């Protein structure tokens, strides 16, 4: 037997939630944009020498359905909060996702990781310091990633598991 | 007179039946003409052989990606994409034919057929036609779908054209 962790990937449309998840599960990337309705994946990994099962919910960033997130937020144990480093609006959208998660779970202590994706791209509009400062104000880790180069992909998911472990063993 | 076009639907290559559509050229001529031309293949490309890649029971059947065959592609007769012509017509119920998009002014070739009223799409997707005959074929397509739209059998436009 191994422990299962219910991870949920959230963030504005087009920030790379699916590309990150597909890199984790399938080890590939494509430039094509296939917008998500809702997808679920499973993968076993070893994190700090301990095998575990990731149950990953890849959610829609399509903002018109923002009123349909409560149930997956109640069910999820930890949240990868993704923005794109070249999209300031998606960084602004982060605050609303976090406030939604805290409000739905009625807790200030919800396992989360801030993920700045697309770090391979030269057109950066969100400074690393800007995101580190926000994550510090949230009390959560920040990881820069590229689903294209795989930079930080494993680290982002593994860190979220570590955050959930701390919350459960609190 | 508004043009009418047909799709001959197949399920894992086995014929299912024919759906016909009225295209509202009287209200959305540019959008109806794109769908009409793609249904005849007269530009050298179009819907023939493409699949319905997303079928969600209770909501809609979506298809039209003839360039990539994975739900990411498609193109119009005017270029890769064209503007939203108007939002005069609404998603009033089953049978409505409307354009898929990736935000404002991104109409290509992907389209969806409603199997229910989808009024929250009003003003965001251009309605341009409706099923004339064969709605029972569209209903028969729904059981090959799922909650997130992934299909359990390959649902294709085996043939299509103008009536
Ligand atoms: C939150 C879950 N969820 C739902 C949904 C919503 C609801 N409601 C909402 C309405 N409530 C009433 C007011 C009270 C009741 C509850 C219930 N259950 C569900 C589903 C089944 O829960 C899993 C949806 C939905 C739609 C999206 C993302 C998530 C969605 C989504 C992503 S991208 C897009 N939408 C537009 C898309 N773009 C592309 O495909 C781009 C591809 C690339 O560039 C060309 C091409 C496109 O044009 N269409 C053509 C139009 C129908 C549309 N797809 C689609 O699939 O809608 C699916 C669905 C089910 C109709 C809506
Ligand atoms: N250069 C680069 N492109 C990326 C990266 N991650 C995603 N993309 C691209 O960004 C687009 C959207 O990616 P996708 O993973 O579909 O984003 P999403 O957040 O899942 N979108 P949605 O909320 O609609 O499901 C695609 O064209 C994809 O190739 C990245 O790290 N670098
Ligand atoms: Mg996605």
Numbering used by the authors:
A (entry chain A): 0 to 169
B (entry chain D): 2 to 164
The authors write:
RAS family genes encode small GTPase proteins that regulate cell proliferation in response to growth factor stimuli. Here we describe RMC-7977, a reversible, tri-complex RAS inhibitor with broad-spectrum activity for the active state of both mutant and wild-type KRAS, NRAS and HRAS variants (a RAS(ON) multi-selective inhibitor). The binary CYPA–compound complex then binds to active RAS (with dissociation constant Kd2) to form a tri-complex structure in which CYPA sterically occludes RAS–effector interactions. Although neither RMC-7977 nor CYPA alone exhibited any measurable binding to GMPPNP–KRAS, RMC-7977 makes multiple π–π and hydrophobic contacts with RAS in the switch I (SWI) and SWII region once the tri-complex is formed.
Kd2 values for the most common oncogenic RAS variants were all within threefold of those for wild-type proteins. The ability of tri-complex formation to sterically disrupt effector binding for the various mutants was also measured, revealing a good correlation between the Kd2 measurements and the biochemical EC50 values for RAS–RAF disruption. Preclinically, RMC-7977 demonstrated potent activity against RAS-addicted tumours carrying various RAS genotypes, particularly against cancer models with KRAS codon 12 mutations (KRASG12X). KRASG12X mutant cell lines were highly sensitive to RMC-7977, with a median EC50 of 2.40 nM. The proximity of the RMC-7977 binding site to RAS mutational hotspots (residues G12, G13 and Q61) presents a unique opportunity to expand this approach further by designing additional mutant-selective tri-complex inhibitors.
